[PDB]
Design an enzyme around this catalytic site. Structure first.
Site, PDB file in Angstrom:
ATOM      1  N   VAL A  39       0.827  -1.408   0.017  1.00  0.00           N
ATOM      2  CA  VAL A  39       0.157  -0.050  -0.072  1.00  0.00           C
ATOM      3  C   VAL A  39       0.852   1.312  -0.057  1.00  0.00           C
ATOM      4  O   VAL A  39       0.340   2.331  -0.594  1.00  0.00           O
ATOM      5  CB  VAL A  39      -1.124   0.139   1.199  1.00  0.00           C
ATOM      6  CG1 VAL A  39      -1.828   1.220   1.127  1.00  0.00           C
ATOM      7  CG2 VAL A  39      -1.766  -1.306   1.370  1.00  0.00           C
ATOM      8  N   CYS A  40       1.818   1.204   0.601  1.00  0.00           N
ATOM      9  CA  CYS A  40       2.904   2.320   0.559  1.00  0.00           C
ATOM     10  C   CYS A  40       3.320   2.936  -0.822  1.00  0.00           C
ATOM     11  O   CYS A  40       3.129   4.178  -0.776  1.00  0.00           O
ATOM     12  CB  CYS A  40       4.035   1.931   1.454  1.00  0.00           C
ATOM     13  SG  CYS A  40       3.709   1.863   3.224  1.00  0.00           S
ATOM     14  N   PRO A  41       3.790   2.349  -1.725  1.00  0.00           N
ATOM     15  CA  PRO A  41       4.330   2.796  -3.036  1.00  0.00           C
ATOM     16  C   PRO A  41       3.027   3.739  -3.675  1.00  0.00           C
ATOM     17  O   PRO A  41       3.454   4.502  -4.364  1.00  0.00           O
ATOM     18  CB  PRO A  41       4.623   1.705  -3.801  1.00  0.00           C
ATOM     19  CG  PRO A  41       4.024   0.605  -3.159  1.00  0.00           C
ATOM     20  CD  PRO A  41       3.741   0.735  -1.607  1.00  0.00           C
TER      21      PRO A  41
END
Lengths: 172, 182, 183, 180, 183, 178, 178, 180, 176, 181
Positions: free
Chosen positions: F45-47
């Site tokens: 989910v971060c990128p």
């Protein structure tokens, strides 16, 4: 905080009685009034005169059911020598009232008469009633001595109240 | 705990009744004179007035000796005044030649150690103070029991003798009587 | 700081003068009843007797309302009685129909927060206490200015009204008038 | 919290005439101030007290007294309560300032703050021209105050201040005070 | 309370709320089993605050069908809230609100959620999404001059319910119904 | 941590255009700052978020805002990610600075630091040119943020700053405030 | 400040990369076995891989000796994986035959006292732990300077000697001697 | 204890070539230092290290490094131990300084002291020419150290110092090294 | 109370040759001092020690040493004890100063004060010309000290102060 | 401050050298016997061995009197042993008939208050402990000056006389003398 309506501080220690060492305490004296009076030192000047006066008059306190005890910060070994010393040589003669020793300073401190400058006590006179409760507090500056007659007066008034229940006026 | 002699006496400032009027007095007003300061529990009590009446009647014996006698209690000034203006036959003080010091805040009784938390009012102390404000004698009674105007006079003579002649006072010491040297 | 109502009132025990005699009274002896406890600085003062007398003359209005009025001061029982014994012509209390409570240990005045460290005298507070010992009204007047017996009765009426009818009393509320229903 | 002591300082946003203006206790120096508290806006006993005091404002204006009503509500609640007419349950329009304490600072300083609540007990404090507390009245919430007794207390403190005399029990204007 | 953090039990609130023109005492445990969107506003009778409340009340059925209760909180009394509701919108009132107006007059709630302002006495604008088990999920705090988004509030709610149900995770800019990232 | 107060300072090593540069909040005075955190490098989910903003940079650029991403990962883990192709699971190459806080100082200062795992929660913070916080947004890790809401709030704060008016609920551009 | 080797070693528990998947391990798991636990500052740095690669290339030498070599750093388990799965041509680890332990919370590096408060990384520690969990060897190197597999082998040989044969080992003692 | 730091100062009485001299860490500034601790004089394993380090001293002296041995024994214990011949269990006559710490300050400072038996573990600390801590080795008592490893470690720390590069694993003398 | 440090200071009244004199440790600079304690006046073991030190006083005087005896008794008690004839159990007239501690603070500083009774244990402290302590002797009460061991000890410290050489076990006069 | 007599002596437990082997000894072990525990600063010193040798040459005077003499320093046991082994011409201890007690931890010297923080070594104390573990004597010498076996015996005799005969020994009292009641 030393006040007339409160239980007197318990004292316990070694005393000279009839040229011998006996161990005494305030609780032994229940049933009797106790006059406990402090003097600064043994082999002093004003001090012996007081102890001798109270001793000579001891029968006045005996008839009154009062025990007079003289306390000082000297050791019992000085108290004894001072008693063995005759009055012409500067001694106490032989005394009819006990000489109590505080070598620990505990007793003079408990009664608040202890002087940090000298290391020896002021002159207090405390009248303790038969139930172990403080009654009268007298503290004198060292140069100036006490009165056997006024101690007798006070002793008589306190007894008058504990019996009659009337309260004692001035100059009584 | 309890006061000691040869130490400066506690300071008192207060409002007092002198000759039927309110005056504010303190300890340093009496410098140069000895001060006998004596406490009593309450106004309109019994043992209490008999002592003040006595110290008041004998006041010239203290005055000749350069002493001021000051009675103190925890009552207000208006009680001191009411009691004063009342005739002795009504149980009052009659009119009084000694100052009545009111300690309302308990300050003075607590300072001299004669205040007890049970009553709210003072034990009877009697303190003798030298002209430099130094404490000399301490006397406290259980208050059924009163003090002696003759013994206060005696003690007074004794300290005055010591300070004057640099000698010391033996037991039962009287006037015109010998002391001991150093 | 100072007190808040709807909280139990500070306790008090002490020696009071009632009908020229000494008696021990405490706040709890008055339970089941309202208590108006008011302070005055000193005996043999000026503004003090006028109030004491006034509450005393009007005592019945406090009695019919189930209220005990108690005056308190930092003077003693012995000072109190001497005052109560005096003739009013002589500046006395006449003879008093309400208890005069001796505060001498100072601890009653401090508990109600009316104690003045400057004079060692009490200010004039007045405290209305409900039958269960709850504090309701608090008044403290500066010493030179005295209180109102009729306003005390007005407030006393109000608190008894909200007690009985569970209503709330609007401003300037008068006796017998009925208030706002919080129904 | 006793009389013959400097009264606590208060400062804050007030509703005056229908505008917000920041007022402080020192502004009123030279004037007597009656500072009185009520628990809540939009309640029962509270408006009746303010209304009565507002209607009687001129009686205080003749004594050189300013009346201020404080509570723990916002200035914005104070304002809307003023705008509301009395027949609608409102304040009509007030001749008296409404001091808002949203921080509880002011209520807590005068010691009228109730922590079971979040709003004040109703106190009344008469403060003399020099900012020195004189009288203290605190009523339990269900029971409101008297405009007429406040005028009576006010007359007395002013009579003492003037003649130097003292005011006995039940003292009203046009009566003798006792000489010192 | 530097800041609250998601995945921790939400701070408890019990208060007195206005629900359909009446006072009801409600708590956080009452809504257990349902999501909660709890949002704070500084003051009644102000500009931005009503527009926010009216907007959540008009859209309230979007939350009801998502199994979520919306509650507005402020530092005003229940009596202000009730007068604000009862007032019509023309006059600047709330109309009549279909969401509960929660009064915290003790400041406890706003201090507990960290949104309370000391220089003010009223709350910043918090929005806290709380899962059916009492766990905090989303935390939003806006400076007062700037208002919130009912549609974004709905988006996050949708997101957490997706995560809850499908054990997936929601990417950036996630729109309702979209597949997320498995495991 | 409240909107009306000055923001916590951060000084750190960041990855800007494939290189290391030391940046600090005072550098960005005069410009708006969007500082957002992600728990870990090399996760799912971060990128998506980082790339979302990195593709959208010119919307922040034209709005006078700088977007900075922070994490508890090292600058070396950052740079490796930023070398990677998105196809490979990496970040591609980013138009926004990747701020490494390995000391946890920064995450803790902003109160988004999770003690259960050493990863930060994902917060988003809007800071005005004078160093004052405006927005606080904190999401649970499984749910990511919205570039559009961040952009929306940007317009809102700049609006009230400029026109003195306050922005209503659901406010967007071309709307007048109050 | 340092921990001393007559004493039970600090417990560690964390997520490890083993064989290419995540497993949770602790120090009481390896009871019955000797342990070599060594720290390196960061993933995706230059000096670190050479040490892990070396020890992982030497695995059976530690295996025949009943010892488990374990790597640890302050990087996330996700950085460990990305690094392991990376080819040695891009600076990756290749596929490691020893566990990669992640300390996100930094509490392992702080427990062993290898944690540097200046960067967020840890120094290079080496700690040899006897089968009952007692600490024996302590080696710590500054960042720029690496360790030796031969020496770790020697100490291991000696510590194992002294327990078995009850004889003390002299200076420069080698694979067997006396 | 961490090696980016300044090394703890030691000052005490050391036995150097038969003489008592007062030395301190600041004296050796400008030079590298190998400071290693041993548990006791007149023990077994300790002589082996002290002697081997002594016999090999020219490798350290050529490397600009002073080797110092420290024990919690008195300087008097040291001297007598150094008078004792190796056949008889002594140190022969050894070329390295023996630092006596009687009050335990030094050993406690470097953290190798254990209150258990009241004598030190064996640490070996390498200290850069500026007095900065570089390497920390601590051996359990039964197990001794390597002169050859200390010589390696020292060669590496100097290589980094001079060439600015770093040292990979298993770095030997005159190996490549990894540029930054 | 260790040997190599400056000794506790004493100040107070002493009976020296029939007179009351104020003395303190600093008065004796340039001289050694043997300060020894005893529990009580008009006791038994105590006078024997004082009279022996008093009878041997010339041995110390020629060794440049002052012997002071301290007790927790008053100067007034000290005075009568020394006014007391030996046959009668007193001190005769004794040639060393009798130091008086009423406040107990001298006995407390040197460590020899007993809380059990208000009396000192018998300590013997040898102090050098610069006021530094040298040796400590503390005897339990029932057992007394030796004037010859004090003399020996005193002789030894003067040997190290003079020759810088060290006195071994059982060292007697002029060995090295 | 200082150790006082008529009080229980501090306990000591350590590793000692007896006969040339190590043994664990402690104060309580010696209960029933008098103990003279005496301190010296260092092994391989000059004044120090003279005292130790003197007590070990006189050891029978103490055993006859039911007293165990124990020598403690801050040196280790291996130093005590090597010293005891070294011959007196090389500066050694000869071989000792008295226990050499090792205080490595400094606990014993600190307990008896003879510990010098300045050199880390110990002063010379001599403590006479009665069979019940009570301290009858404290003797502390500055280091340059050593102690006396004969005064130690004299004192030992005196505390035994007082315990047996319930008398009190005057100044200068020796064996065969009388005492006071």
């Amino acid at each position: 905080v030393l006040l007339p309506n409160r239980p007197a501080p318990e004292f316990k220690g070694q005393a000279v009685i009839n040229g011998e060492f006996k161990e005494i305490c305030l609780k032994d004296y229940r049933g009797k009034y106790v006059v406990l009076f402090f003097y600064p030192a043994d082999f002093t000047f004003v001090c012996p005169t007081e102890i001798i006066a109270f001793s000579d008059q001891v029968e006045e306190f005996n008839s009154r059911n009062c025990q007079v005890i003289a306390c000082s910060t000297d050791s019992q070994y000085s108290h004894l020598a001072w008693d063995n010393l005759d009055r012409k040589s500067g001694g106490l003669g032989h005394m009819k009232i006990p000489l109590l020793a505080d070598r620990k300073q505990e007793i003079s401190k408990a009664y608040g008469v202890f002087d940090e400058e000298d290391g020896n006590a002021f002159r207090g006179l405390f009248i303790i009633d038969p139930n172990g409760i403080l009654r009268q507090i007298t503290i004198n500056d060292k140069p100036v001595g006490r009165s056997v007659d006024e101690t007798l007066r006070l002793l008589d008034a306190f007894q008058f109240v504990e019996k009659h229940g009337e309260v004692c006026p001035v100059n009584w």
